[PDB]
Write an enzyme that holds these catalytic residues in place. Structure first.
Site, PDB file in Angstrom:
ATOM      1  N   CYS A  91      22.157  41.117 -77.314  1.00  0.00           N
ATOM      2  CA  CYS A  91      23.099  41.337 -76.225  1.00  0.00           C
ATOM      3  C   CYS A  91      23.851  42.669 -76.328  1.00  0.00           C
ATOM      4  O   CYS A  91      24.527  42.941 -77.327  1.00  0.00           O
ATOM      5  CB  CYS A  91      24.091  40.181 -76.144  1.00  0.00           C
ATOM      6  SG  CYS A  91      25.404  40.463 -74.959  1.00  0.00           S
ATOM      7  N   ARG A 112      28.367  42.865 -75.835  1.00  0.00           N
ATOM      8  CA  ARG A 112      29.198  42.134 -76.792  1.00  0.00           C
ATOM      9  C   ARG A 112      30.615  42.688 -76.998  1.00  0.00           C
ATOM     10  O   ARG A 112      31.425  42.052 -77.671  1.00  0.00           O
ATOM     11  CB  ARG A 112      28.481  42.019 -78.144  1.00  0.00           C
ATOM     12  CG  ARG A 112      27.337  41.006 -78.155  1.00  0.00           C
ATOM     13  CD  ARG A 112      26.700  40.898 -79.531  1.00  0.00           C
ATOM     14  NE  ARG A 112      25.701  41.935 -79.756  1.00  0.00           N
ATOM     15  CZ  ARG A 112      25.296  42.321 -80.961  1.00  0.00           C
ATOM     16  NH1 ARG A 112      25.823  41.763 -82.044  1.00  0.00           N
ATOM     17  NH2 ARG A 112      24.378  43.271 -81.086  1.00  0.00           N
ATOM     18  N   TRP A 169      28.334  39.140 -66.431  1.00  0.00           N
ATOM     19  CA  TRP A 169      27.848  39.790 -65.217  1.00  0.00           C
ATOM     20  C   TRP A 169      26.533  40.482 -65.541  1.00  0.00           C
ATOM     21  O   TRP A 169      26.194  40.648 -66.716  1.00  0.00           O
ATOM     22  CB  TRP A 169      28.864  40.795 -64.677  1.00  0.00           C
ATOM     23  CG  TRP A 169      29.378  41.733 -65.713  1.00  0.00           C
ATOM     24  CD1 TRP A 169      28.770  42.864 -66.181  1.00  0.00           C
ATOM     25  CD2 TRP A 169      30.620  41.624 -66.413  1.00  0.00           C
ATOM     26  NE1 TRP A 169      29.564  43.467 -67.133  1.00  0.00           N
ATOM     27  CE2 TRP A 169      30.706  42.725 -67.290  1.00  0.00           C
ATOM     28  CE3 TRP A 169      31.673  40.704 -66.375  1.00  0.00           C
ATOM     29  CZ2 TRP A 169      31.798  42.920 -68.133  1.00  0.00           C
ATOM     30  CZ3 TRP A 169      32.757  40.901 -67.204  1.00  0.00           C
ATOM     31  CH2 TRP A 169      32.813  42.000 -68.074  1.00  0.00           C
ATOM     32  N   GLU A 199      18.408  44.588 -65.363  1.00  0.00           N
ATOM     33  CA  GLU A 199      17.849  43.248 -65.507  1.00  0.00           C
ATOM     34  C   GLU A 199      17.250  42.804 -64.179  1.00  0.00           C
ATOM     35  O   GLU A 199      16.248  42.089 -64.147  1.00  0.00           O
ATOM     36  CB  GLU A 199      18.920  42.251 -65.937  1.00  0.00           C
ATOM     37  CG  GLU A 199      19.578  42.550 -67.274  1.00  0.00           C
ATOM     38  CD  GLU A 199      20.630  41.519 -67.616  1.00  0.00           C
ATOM     39  OE1 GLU A 199      20.256  40.459 -68.155  1.00  0.00           O
ATOM     40  OE2 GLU A 199      21.823  41.767 -67.346  1.00  0.00           O
TER      41      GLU A 199
HETATM   42  C1  HEM Z   1      29.620  40.230 -69.751  1.00  0.00           C
HETATM   43  C2  HEM Z   1      28.455  40.719 -69.317  1.00  0.00           C
HETATM   44  C3  HEM Z   1      27.194  40.677 -70.099  1.00  0.00           C
HETATM   45  C4  HEM Z   1      26.188  41.591 -70.009  1.00  0.00           C
HETATM   46  C5  HEM Z   1      26.173  42.804 -69.112  1.00  0.00           C
HETATM   47  C6  HEM Z   1      25.162  41.193 -70.909  1.00  0.00           C
HETATM   48  C7  HEM Z   1      23.984  41.925 -71.055  1.00  0.00           C
HETATM   49  C8  HEM Z   1      22.893  41.368 -71.683  1.00  0.00           C
HETATM   50  C9  HEM Z   1      21.574  41.841 -71.524  1.00  0.00           C
HETATM   51  C10 HEM Z   1      21.145  43.005 -70.671  1.00  0.00           C
HETATM   52  C11 HEM Z   1      20.757  41.066 -72.273  1.00  0.00           C
HETATM   53  C12 HEM Z   1      19.255  41.249 -72.388  1.00  0.00           C
HETATM   54  C13 HEM Z   1      18.492  40.021 -71.888  1.00  0.00           C
HETATM   55  C14 HEM Z   1      17.224  40.379 -71.163  1.00  0.00           C
HETATM   56  O1  HEM Z   1      16.737  41.523 -71.288  1.00  0.00           O
HETATM   57  O2  HEM Z   1      16.657  39.523 -70.442  1.00  0.00           O
HETATM   58  C15 HEM Z   1      21.577  40.097 -72.906  1.00  0.00           C
HETATM   59  C16 HEM Z   1      21.083  39.144 -73.762  1.00  0.00           C
HETATM   60  C17 HEM Z   1      21.900  38.134 -74.228  1.00  0.00           C
HETATM   61  N1  HEM Z   1      23.209  37.936 -73.984  1.00  0.00           N
HETATM   62 FE1  HEM Z   1      24.397  39.024 -73.003  1.00  0.00          FE
HETATM   63  N2  HEM Z   1      25.501  40.048 -71.522  1.00  0.00           N
HETATM   64  C18 HEM Z   1      26.740  39.679 -71.108  1.00  0.00           C
HETATM   65  C19 HEM Z   1      27.508  38.559 -71.484  1.00  0.00           C
HETATM   66  C20 HEM Z   1      27.092  37.573 -72.381  1.00  0.00           C
HETATM   67  C21 HEM Z   1      27.767  36.375 -72.707  1.00  0.00           C
HETATM   68  C22 HEM Z   1      29.083  35.928 -72.121  1.00  0.00           C
HETATM   69  C23 HEM Z   1      27.004  35.700 -73.661  1.00  0.00           C
HETATM   70  C24 HEM Z   1      27.274  34.391 -74.313  1.00  0.00           C
HETATM   71  C25 HEM Z   1      28.478  33.856 -74.544  1.00  0.00           C
HETATM   72  C26 HEM Z   1      25.846  36.510 -73.896  1.00  0.00           C
HETATM   73  C27 HEM Z   1      24.824  36.212 -74.764  1.00  0.00           C
HETATM   74  C28 HEM Z   1      23.569  36.831 -74.675  1.00  0.00           C
HETATM   75  C29 HEM Z   1      22.406  36.261 -75.369  1.00  0.00           C
HETATM   76  C30 HEM Z   1      22.375  35.019 -76.223  1.00  0.00           C
HETATM   77  C31 HEM Z   1      21.369  37.067 -75.089  1.00  0.00           C
HETATM   78  C32 HEM Z   1      19.949  36.910 -75.578  1.00  0.00           C
HETATM   79  C33 HEM Z   1      19.233  35.729 -74.919  1.00  0.00           C
HETATM   80  C34 HEM Z   1      17.821  35.686 -75.439  1.00  0.00           C
HETATM   81  O3  HEM Z   1      17.599  35.622 -76.668  1.00  0.00           O
HETATM   82  O4  HEM Z   1      16.867  35.731 -74.642  1.00  0.00           O
HETATM   83  N3  HEM Z   1      25.949  37.640 -73.126  1.00  0.00           N
HETATM   84  N4  HEM Z   1      22.906  40.295 -72.550  1.00  0.00           N
HETATM   85  C1  LIG Z   2      24.957  35.829 -70.258  1.00  0.00           C
HETATM   86  C2  LIG Z   2      23.994  36.908 -69.841  1.00  0.00           C
HETATM   87  C3  LIG Z   2      24.433  37.996 -69.090  1.00  0.00           C
HETATM   88  C4  LIG Z   2      23.517  38.977 -68.723  1.00  0.00           C
HETATM   89  N1  LIG Z   2      23.891  40.054 -67.988  1.00  0.00           N
HETATM   90  N2  LIG Z   2      22.231  38.865 -69.096  1.00  0.00           N
HETATM   91  C5  LIG Z   2      21.782  37.823 -69.820  1.00  0.00           C
HETATM   92  C6  LIG Z   2      20.318  37.816 -70.169  1.00  0.00           C
HETATM   93  O1  LIG Z   2      19.909  36.793 -71.075  1.00  0.00           O
HETATM   94  C7  LIG Z   2      18.733  36.162 -70.762  1.00  0.00           C
HETATM   95  C8  LIG Z   2      18.300  36.194 -69.440  1.00  0.00           C
HETATM   96  N3  LIG Z   2      17.166  35.594 -69.067  1.00  0.00           N
HETATM   97  C9  LIG Z   2      16.416  34.950 -69.965  1.00  0.00           C
HETATM   98  C10 LIG Z   2      16.792  34.880 -71.300  1.00  0.00           C
HETATM   99  C11 LIG Z   2      15.922  34.130 -72.285  1.00  0.00           C
HETATM  100  N4  LIG Z   2      14.504  34.516 -72.152  1.00  0.00           N
HETATM  101  C12 LIG Z   2      13.703  33.698 -73.080  1.00  0.00           C
HETATM  102  C13 LIG Z   2      12.214  33.918 -72.841  1.00  0.00           C
HETATM  103  C14 LIG Z   2      11.745  35.216 -73.464  1.00  0.00           C
HETATM  104  C15 LIG Z   2      11.574  35.328 -74.842  1.00  0.00           C
HETATM  105  C16 LIG Z   2      11.138  36.531 -75.393  1.00  0.00           C
HETATM  106  C17 LIG Z   2      10.872  37.620 -74.569  1.00  0.00           C
HETATM  107  C18 LIG Z   2      11.043  37.512 -73.192  1.00  0.00           C
HETATM  108  F1  LIG Z   2      10.793  38.564 -72.387  1.00  0.00           F
HETATM  109  C19 LIG Z   2      11.478  36.309 -72.646  1.00  0.00           C
HETATM  110  C20 LIG Z   2      17.972  35.491 -71.712  1.00  0.00           C
HETATM  111  C21 LIG Z   2      22.657  36.817 -70.213  1.00  0.00           C
END
Ligand code: HEM
Ligand SMILES: Cc1cc(N)nc(COc2cncc(CNCCc3cccc(F)c3)c2)c1
Ligand code: HEM
Ligand SMILES: Cc1cc(N)nc(COc2cncc(CNCCc3cccc(F)c3)c2)c1
Ligand SMILES: C[C@H](O)[C@H](O)[C@H]1CNc2nc(N)[nH]c(=O)c2N1
Ligand SMILES: C[C@H](O)[C@H](O)[C@H]1CNc2nc(N)[nH]c(=O)c2N1
Ligand SMILES: [Cl-]
Ligand SMILES: [Cl-]
Lengths: 362, 362
Positions: free
Chosen positions: B65, B68, B237, B242
């Site tokens: 993420c 963070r 957000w 994405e």
């Molecule tokens: C506040 C705005 C936030 C932004 C802009 C943001 C941005 C991102 C982005 C761009 C990813 C990449 C995921 C992808 O490429 O599909 C990501 C992954 C992730 N974010 Fe955030 N995030 C935010 C908030 C949060 C919050 C509030 C949480 C949890 C409390 C969180 C937990 C995670 C987790 C767990 C992943 C990885 C999920 C996975 O393994 O697939 N994020 N975030």
């Molecule tokens: C909370 C939050 C905010 C934000 N702006 N973006 C996110 C993105 O996090 C995820 C969004 N969509 C799917 C996932 C989990 N995807 C699991 C499947 C997967 C595994 C490995 C590679 C892959 F491309 C796809 C996470 C999460």
């Protein structure tokens, strides 16, 4: 220990090399020959067949290289016979000429005598055979910052750059026995350069950008069957992004994005306008266009990725394990538009291969 | 073994949590309480303070993420008190409403009762609370292909989609004791959507693209001190890429690049024209513009990377080890224009954290 390492690597290499060349029945005798030769001399000498294929295998095993599809067509020049700095200079000049090939770039490697007791016979100081000098003094930045330390080294040795943004660095290398390296100015007739223009935007030429045609890595070590070829420069053709997304774009390189934005007529004020992204695309279109107009070989990152997919497929069909470094294989623009982005790669090190070595300066 | 694992994790969590909260002197007594409670019941119950901070620590430890920086301002909703599907549905509806906040998105997590004997109390089937359905039959592709298997599952259970490219999937979850999940249609008044327009190119609206405002991940497990919160949906957000570089761009998603190229008036014939790269940039500019015009929170990848740099700096100043996944942290467009690209990250797993879990369908 040193010699046991050599024998183990030699055993592994010869078996694999002779397999691929369909010479498996000759492995046994050649290994004895090598074993006797290591016992007597502390080393062994590659046949020309072994050396050529070793250099090819080494390219095939280069995890960070996207252009490996053409590993087997590498042009290998055997220069283990050189003994004088005049011979090294002329070998280096020749490499530039034949690899350039009037723009139709030939992937080529020139192989110099290997280390003896870890003792270098020839020690090349250049990072690439053709590169631009860099200067930094009194807040004044000129040329390529990545070249600042080599430039200062050359200028110690009596060379002086014109302090243009594109000074060609001299060839610089040291011979076994000499305390100082020698340097030779590059004949401009040997060096093809490409002015960067844009297909649609006439004002792009106002930037007065250019780059050299052929990337010739000259500071890595080629390792084949336990033999360390520390001096063995090699080249391919450029992938456009290396020039447009990195060399000309990085803040720590030529840092041209703000200037690109201005000449393409967009504001460079707001992150949300994605002006850096737009400038990068146009600069990269310009690089590809310019090389093609001049008749200098180049590949775009999409075509390159398609070729790499075929490399992956060929590895599988040949029953070879595929290795790769995802972090280097993805292109620095639109990486998610390539298949590479969407899969994973085993980053294991297989030999023969090319390796980093410590710089003699710095 | 199961309970020893729980006690070890609890010990590590409470010590760390109470340190950060300046409650270090209360660690000793609280650990005894927990130790007795595990002995008697086979588990322990988090105080609201522990739960809130645990969910925050978990976000802070999310290696993939980029957002963070704002870990400590997460809005934690404690719903361990729910027992009925009506209560879960209303809790989910409420999460959407308060997190959306009329467009000024509040990063929020709603926490449901945890697993008992590895037995789920609530089992959420949705990947995100708000997502589009996907269909594939007789060569006919409609909607989001990533949603094809969940869509077919819902349609087993009596739901029927309109087969528009943007059907809102119903909420779908199963309660402990029930054999089938239940599903509830989303009230459209709860779901903000954004039509995609371009600031300069009027024809962009002809694509009739849109996306939902708030990404609410609802299928990951929150682990805090050995307690498995399998149902604990969370949102932030969007980062623009994405949506514009992945959701709408991937060939295996909405696959819109050729159509983008046409409406922005460029040819999609030659790799060397970099038309995919140019289309990606414009589509991404459109996404950012559209969200901002509607007053829906969003961040561009440059601003996000700058924020992440500050997260790195804060970790250092606080004396915390920083962990991260380079492959997920780099944005899918112009990654080399961010600092992230140019450094490395330790991808170690620190708890508390969010984890993948097996899907109940497929
Ligand atoms: C506040 C705005 C936030 C932004 C802009 C943001 C941005 C991102 C982005 C761009 C990813 C990449 C995921 C992808 O490429 O599909 C990501 C992954 C992730 N974010 Fe955030 N995030 C935010 C908030 C949060 C919050 C509030 C949480 C949890 C409390 C969180 C937990 C995670 C987790 C767990 C992943 C990885 C999920 C996975 O393994 O697939 N994020 N975030
Ligand atoms: C909370 C939050 C905010 C934000 N702006 N973006 C996110 C993105 O996090 C995820 C969004 N969509 C799917 C996932 C989990 N995807 C699991 C499947 C997967 C595994 C490995 C590679 C892959 F491309 C796809 C996470 C999460
Ligand atoms: C034929 C055209 C070729 C293309 C388009 C190509 C493309 C690339 C690219 C884009 C990189 C990434 C390097 C960077 O990002 O700075 C790379 C790395 C590399 N290539 Fe190639 N390459 C080609 C030929 C060759 C040849 C002929 C060899 C050697 C015989 C070779 C060996 C390598 C090695 C060793 C690296 C990694 C160097 C390092 O670790 O820094 N390539 N290649
Ligand atoms: C033969 C060839 C063809 C082609 N098109 N491209 C290449 C690129 O290979 C390199 C080009 N320039 C420098 C290097 C080696 N860089 C070593 C320093 C380094 C290490 C780690 C990360 C980094 F960014 C930089 C390799 C090589
Ligand atoms: C597994 C494979 O590396 C895959 O392409 C990864 C790469 N990095 C990523 N990065 C982000 N942000 N999102 C993703 O889905 C992926 N997928
Ligand atoms: C070490 C750090 O990951 C650095 O940014 C890497 C990333 N991947 C790369 N990929 C390429 N092609 N070239 C590079 O110089 C780097 N540098
Ligand atoms: Cl280069
Ligand atoms: Cl998403």
């Amino acid at each position: 220990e040193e010699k046991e390492i050599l024998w183990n690597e030699a055993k592994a290499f010869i078996a694999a090399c002779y397999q691929e060349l369909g010479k498996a029945a000759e492995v046994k005798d050649r290994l004895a020959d090598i074993k006797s030769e290591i016992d007597l001399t502390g080393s062994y000498v590659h046949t020309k067949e072994e050396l050529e294929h070793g250099a090819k295998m080494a390219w095939r095993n280069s995890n960070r290289c996207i252009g490996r599809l053409f590993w087997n067509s590498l042009n290998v020049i055997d220069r283990r016979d050189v003994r004088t700095k005049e011979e090294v200079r002329d070998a280096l000049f020749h490499h530039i000429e034949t690899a350039t090939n009037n723009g139709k770039i030939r992937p080529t490697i020139t192989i110099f005598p290997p280390e003896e007791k870890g003792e270098k016979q020839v020690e090349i100081w250049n990072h690439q055979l053709i590169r631009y000098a860099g200067y930094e003094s009194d807040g004044e930045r000129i040329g390529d910052p990545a070249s600042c330390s080599l430039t200062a080294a050359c200028e110690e040795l009596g060379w002086r750059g014109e302090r243009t943004d594109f000074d060609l660095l001299p060839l610089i290398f040291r011979m076994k026995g000499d305390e100082q390296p020698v340097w030779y100015e590059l004949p401009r007739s040997l060096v093809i350069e490409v002015p960067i223009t844009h297909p649609d935007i006439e004002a792009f030429s106002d930037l007065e950008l250019k780059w050299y045609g052929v990337p010739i890595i000259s500071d890595m070590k080629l390792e084949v069957g336990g033999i360390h070829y520390n001096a063995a420069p090699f080249n391919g053709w450029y992938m456009g992004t290396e020039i447009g997304a990195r060399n000309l774009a990085d803040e720590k390189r030529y840092d041209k994005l703000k200037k690109v934005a201005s000449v393409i007529g967009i504001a460079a004020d707001y992150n949300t306008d994605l002006w850096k992204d737009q400038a990068l695309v146009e600069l990269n279109k310009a690089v590809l266009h310019s090389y093609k107009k001049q008749g200098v070989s180049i590949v775009d990152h999409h075509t390159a990725a398609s070729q790499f997919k075929r490399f992956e497929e060929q590895a599988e069909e040949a029953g070879r394990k595929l290795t790769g470094d995802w972090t280097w294989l993805i292109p620095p623009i639109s990486p998610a538009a390539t298949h590479i982005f969407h899969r994973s790669y085993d980053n294991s090190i297989v030999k023969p291969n090319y390796f980093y070595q410590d710089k003699p300066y710095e």
